[PDB]
Amino acid sequence: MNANKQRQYNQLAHELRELQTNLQETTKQLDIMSKQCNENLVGQLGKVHGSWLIGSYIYYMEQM
């Protein structure tokens, strides 16, 4: 077949390999950042801080 088609497909393969590597990396990064979100932000920070705040709220509203 045509030489230009040959070279085009051949370097398409390389670009797709590199894209696959970048997708592995972004999967890793998204997993890590998600983990930080659900466990630290919401599971640890949000849960405990909201517990303190809402307990204070119910107590000081009971102060009526």
Binding site: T26, N40, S51
Partner: protein
């Protein structure tokens, strides 16, 4: 003489290569942003760990002595 389909397909293949290159650039910048945001956010694990530890500490301190107040 040459089949025009061959030429048009070569052209569209060039376009697709360019588009894949743009996609690669965008994904690389996305990865950079994610790395930066995680590195900056690393302090929040510390904050959450200490807050959770303190919460558990006060909970068992109310358990240990009989000073735990009744549930409102």
């Amino acid at each position: 003489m040459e089949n025009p389909h061959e030429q048009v397909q070569a052209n569209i293949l060039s376009r697709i290569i360019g588009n894949v290159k743009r996609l690669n650039e965008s994904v690389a910048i996305l990865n950079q942003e994610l790395v930066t945001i995680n590195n900056r956010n690393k302090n929040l694990e510390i904050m959450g760990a200490i807050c959770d530890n303190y919460h558990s500490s006060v909970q068992f301190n109310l358990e240990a002595t009989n000073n735990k107040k009744p549930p409102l």
